[PDB]
Symmetry: D2
Subunit: 499 residues, 4 copies
């Protein structure tokens, strides 16, 4: 047992790399995959959120499919209270990002659970009269132009795909309806969505998970609503249907990142094909260097049990091996009985899978597919990661203001952690979207001599790395800086020993 699966990292083939995986080779830590947890009744309290952060929650997700604005406002206030409870020591302080998940073009049912028999008959009524008198033969939908977008012989899936219209069971109240095959004329940004996004920018959110993004214009519509006041809010496009998968290329280019929303995608396309769409979207985002999130049902059984299933354990690890920048928890942290155990489990799995990555092939294929550029920062990023592998550096220290220089380093997936020193608090929170970036917010005021002010932030990362066990005095690290203040000038790579 060497460490960090380094015996397997030196295998000439991927098959031999698999054979040399050792359960007794413990991970030289620094977890390089971000953990996003949806907040709900089980995790809304300040004391709970403090434990979630200590257990490894890097992004708090707000699902605007439910709850009011004042409800989500207290959640945000609770998240910032729990996060700022560690701000007394900036060396150990961990930024925590806030994410708004839009409701999007949803389709619900009416009120009163009944019992749907297989082969029975139910008259789907887009009639506001029976909006509360739903039985076993008269179901109501809130979709305008449902009769136009549907064709005879097609299928309809109510309550997260449980009932099929066919295979149906106990139909509840106000359950979601999925209409695969697509034709949904519902707007990309609804009236509720517009007010939610305007609420998000008012609340200084860090990122937006846009639901049911079908085409590239949907992301432009979302970015237009965020306006100039929220122009720095990263837009993560959720791919949840067939149209989003086919139009993924134009969606990826218009978006800041992608979430593989496997829950709705598992209903819109055959569930046996979800792994295809996941490994495809993760590969293309890794190719383009944009964040990708694997979400939904990763540790589903932990909603009721303190330990996950074997399938759930492998799913989290395989999402990391796929190359996902972040993993997500929904009901496991929003409503389950073991939110802290779900967060801790994803942290332990991610750390093991990060060591089991075949870096030798990944780094070669990432450069082989990346184009030649004239951006000096991009060339500095490859040279830094190449140097980091060459000397087994304890970290790559990147001074960045917008996060860009750190993102360009993370695109090439170094094994060493990326310590991104920034004075921009939003940049530090947003850095969690990119694999391997450990953001550190330096609150020290700006010095007069610019060379000394850069030396300050470098030494800040040194103490942070020594305090968190990333390296020790005398170790080699890679330091990325630029030639003048302001963003966009990162061009200097140094190999320096830590003091």
């Amino acid at each position: 047992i060497q460490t960090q699966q380094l015996h397997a990292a030196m295998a000439d083939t991927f098959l031999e790399h698999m054979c040399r995986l050792d359960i007794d080779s413990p991970p030289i830590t620094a977890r390089n995959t971000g953990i996003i947890c949806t907040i709900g009744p089980a995790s809304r309290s300040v004391e709970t959120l403090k434990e979630m952060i200590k257990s490894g929650m890097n992004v708090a997700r707000l699902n605007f499919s439910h709850g009011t604005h004042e409800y989500h406002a207290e959640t945000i206030k609770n998240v910032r209270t729990a996060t700022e409870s560690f701000a007394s020591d900036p060396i150990l302080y961990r930024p925590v990002a806030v994410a708004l998940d839009t409701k999007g073009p949803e389709i619900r049912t009416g009120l009163i659970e009944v019992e749907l028999k297989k082969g029975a008959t139910l008259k789907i009524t887009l009639d506001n009269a029976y909006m509360e008198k739903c039985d076993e033969n008269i179901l109501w939908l809130d979709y305008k132009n449902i009769c136009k977008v549907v064709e005879v012989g097609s299928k309809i899936y109510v309550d997260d795909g449980l009932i099929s219209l066919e295979n149906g069971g106990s139909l509840g109240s106000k359950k979601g309806v999925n209409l695969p095959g697509a034709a949904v004329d519902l707007p990309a940004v609804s009236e509720k969505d517009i007010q939610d996004l305007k609420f998000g920018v008012e609340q200084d959110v860090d990122m937006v998970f846009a639901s049911f993004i079908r085409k590239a214009s949907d992301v432009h519509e979302v970015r237009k609503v965020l306006g100039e006041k929220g122009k720095n809010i990263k837009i993560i496009s959720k791919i949840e249907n067939h149209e989003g998968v086919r139009r993924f290329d134009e969606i990826l280019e218009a978006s800041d990142g992608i979430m593989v929303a496997r829950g709705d995608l598992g209903i819109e396309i055959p569930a046996e094909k979800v792994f295809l769409a996941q490994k495809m979207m993760i590969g293309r985002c890794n190719r383009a260097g944009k964040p990708v999130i694997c979400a939904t049902q990763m540790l589903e059984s932990m909603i009721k049990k303190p330990r996950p299933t074997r399938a759930e354990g492998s799913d989290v690890a395989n999402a990391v091996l796929d190359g996902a920048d972040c993993i997500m928890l929904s009901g496991e942290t929003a409503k389950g009985d073991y939110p802290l155990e779900a967060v801790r489990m994803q942290h332990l799995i991610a750390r093991e899978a990060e060591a089991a990555i075949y870096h030798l092939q990944l780094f070669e294929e990432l450069r082989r597919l990346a184009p030649i550029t004239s951006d000096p920062t991009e060339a500095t990023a490859v040279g830094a990661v190449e140097a980091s592998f060459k000397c087994c550096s304890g970290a790559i220290i990147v001074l960045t203001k917008s996060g860009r220089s750190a993102h360009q380093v993370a695109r090439y997936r170094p094994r060493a952690p990326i310590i991104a020193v920034t004075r921009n608090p939003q940049t530090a929170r947003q850095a969690h979207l990119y694999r391997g970036i450990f953001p550190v917010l330096c609150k020290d005021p700006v010095q007069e001599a610019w060379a000394e002010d850069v030396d300050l932030r470098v030494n800040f990362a040194m103490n942070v790395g020594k305090a968190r066990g990333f390296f020790k005095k005398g170790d080699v690290v890679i330091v990325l800086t630029g030639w003048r203040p302001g963003s966009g000038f990162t061009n200097t790579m140094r190999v320096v020993p830590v003091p």
Copy 2:
């Protein structure tokens, strides 16, 4: 689109991932075998027939529970459902019977004939007076030498890993434990002692009766629970003796010692099962995927069957649709290189045994198309040594030829299955149609990825050349009827130069007549 063949011709693994297409329909022939545990929800002849039609290849009997009378009837029901299709040998699908041994299990007593509290006090005693009298305060387990294996504050898990304890005080015939993770206790629950060394024998006195029962019931394979060393496999082999010398022994690796000594266990085994259920308790659950990918790769390297098992579609016990994690697990096990995937409670006792079998079938077929054959075939060859066996050279030549012509199938005539096993080791994309007159060979063929066994019941022809061609034409008709290929396509045919095992040396690229 078709077959993920645009992704199959990528220069890098990353580009291969980028070219994965949900709109490219899969092959047709599912290569990864499906093993289903037969239990109350599936042991009926009517259900078993639909299990076979849904894709079940191996019927696994878990001897951790049930009597020999109960298992004999289940086996009888499996063969009644299987022989229900024996009238048309062209469409007849062999179905193997697997015996899963109890092994060195540690079980608890019977609750009165409860519900533990989180952080309470649980006294674990060996006094047999509390065996049929278990309460929330006194707990009896059948591992007599328990205190001579556990120490201070040792973690001890009950109820398939759910309830967790901590030996707060020791004793000689009792143990005082403080609950670390509460939960509703039960009767006759399994107990794991991770980080300790149980001294129970590899083959218990009960396993002797079940292994002898398996021989007289003509089972095709034994799943030996809790193998730790090569000598455990030899013990199972010696116990089976001459009457069970052809029964294949699958070593179930479910603890730290089995993983540590996997190489010697694999060398002595006929195959391996990644029994993730117990393994996820004996070692940290976040490390299971490492042990699975290690054992699958090593078994692929050695050309030996590997089974990924336990909790693959666990939520389907109660729901007609699996979770996304379960959808990825089945797909990733196939992509890892597993010859077989298994279902336990999903088929033995769950509410949707047929939906679980169908889901594994659909996922496995999709995953098989998504395999990066350009890298896999290249890496399996560079790692396999140069050989003098003509069958090995013919097998890899047949696989290379099947990739070159995009063959509809690789037809293999075999008595023992070996020649077909040697083809599957190189993982062709095309299905391997192994024609045989040995019914046991046809059932045992399901252990190897891609082998579609067909049982030839035609009488032996007078001229050997005619008997060979009769069996080749049987595979032709089978592939045509099963939709594997059509007339005009090219298939590879593997025969030998003389009758008897061990002479396969002839590879022919023939058109489908």
Copy 3:
């Protein structure tokens, strides 16, 4: 056989593992083409050329008459049939006809064929097309046979005479005259070759002289044609039509010796049966520092296409006058084989040199060494990666047999073939083991030398009545050939390729059998 360097994971350490103490196998896979001339024309010398390793005899039709060439062909066929007493060790020898082509030659120096003049650099020289000076050239006026030499060369052009050794600068141009200034001088002889780089030489690709030479080749039953100065694919079609129906099985080798032939190489190779990198004229028509680029480009493209490629000209040039080559020439032989050249050639080394046999032996020695040094692991992988999927059962059987040959490290791949296609499809994937190609067609046994690794063997036994017994006779004939020539011994594992019915195009059966 450099087996340690063959198991390396990288090309670099494969080079580091190259061992001068690891001996090669017996079978030399690279064909040797020997140009026959005054030093190699006799039946006695030709016998030793075959014993030294000659597989193809080249006849350069730029000089000589039909009767002189017919007697050379007769002496060749006599020297090879001298060994027809033992069909086990009988090595076939092909005959190749190198066309004259659109050549530009000067007149005679002072009415003599042997006289020479010394051109001093910087002086002047008049080039005229008036036939009155065709036999009266000197250091002042030079005659050449290209009539349109003025309507193709402008002022400042550079003319090269005698293998590009003499260079002229076209100072002033005339209607039928050409005023030049000598750049590089020296001895100017009679009837020397003239190269006009960068000029559109409008000479016919198939002149009337070549038309009769090709008709002579058809009548003399030549195996292949080396077509000089192929500029486009239509030039290969003209050669194809002249050979007509009677010369249909005569393989056409397009000689790339100009800038246009390199630029239009794709359409030429697709219309050709083979390619020769004729570096002599190529080194003059294009800069000499670019010849290796054209050589590696053409060798790789024909390796990718599965068509024969030949490395020619000045490979052991110093051996014309000396019994041992230079280090550069020894390096050029091995690098040609390492490049992937199906055959290496000798021109003046065997045509007129003082050591024709030593050059043949030197080429055979270096080829055997470079064959073992080939990175088969990367070559076979890259050849399969770039070859398309096929619906032909023979091609799938060929790559399967080669793949099986690497798995067992077989002594050989025995291939029964009538037209040679079966053996060519095996050689296309470059197995390490020799390809013993059994045939009853004498022409295919001669044309098989054009493909690397094919050891052609002509069976003399009569066709047995039972076809399955006639196959085993030919199969066991190759076993005798392999055991005799030391390619393998009893107990060794070999690959044997047969078909399912007589006639060409049915090879589909691969058998892994031990040597009886």
Copy 4:
């Protein structure tokens, strides 16, 4: 352009198929040219033409000749070299190499498959240290003891003189690993090597020694008979052209000319041909495979200079940089960059004149001798030397204003602290 289409091929076979004779190479020739100086090129005026035609190292064959004669050849070499010193932007350093006579039994030349440095070798070696030669071609080196024997003879006075051993027999090939570890480089002396071992095996030992030297990051010279026919002819043979190109493709840092420049009839033509072929073959190398295989076999390091070097080569491929500018005092930092064989030329700025002359032994290093005085502010003195390299690349046509280049410097003055890589445009 410089076979850029062939460089982007996914396979080595497709890389050959893409080699285009119509894709012109860059003006920067990375392979050093060593010319043996003799009667045909001893004059001051031709030595100027030899330099103008691309000569980088002047080899003095001590198998014959006296010290008063070889010192006059050196003086003329330094005379012709310093004739261009009136312009440090275009000045090219020219190295001086002493090839020892060694155990040479003679009155022709006898070979048969003896001391390392006998009395004649020591006197000539001491004359080399007195004449301030940059390197010594130790003739016939059979074991590492011979290299130590020679290194002890040069002493601490010539401790910086680079000992590069000439492998000339079967023993040196078998004991090559211990010889290479004790040497500063290797010359594959193909002349004597072709006699001691079968001629058909010379290419085996050549590619063996070049690959191992490439692996170890030590210079290797391919020597002798590369253009032999040019001794009496103005154009080489096709085999000689392919030999020059294949040596460069093998990975040889320098190519050599012996009789072609020493006594041949076309000295300048032989130097020009080696120049033209070298740059054509440099564009034809499969950098995609070479860079990967060089790193796969290079071990993990803890030296900041080695990590900065491979990071700079990786960055230079990423931006297709015009050059890798490396400030170096001993040349070592430029040597570590050249070990990973970048496509871009390595402009090694130095003030040490010997470091500049010795840099010709390493592929891709273009040494420039900075004559400007040291500045008080060290940061300004660094930018001055960086600006010197920028003006050199523009004047010599290696790149133009606006092009991207990699600049390697260190964090403090003194040798051994190169650790800073900057990606900067050309002003």
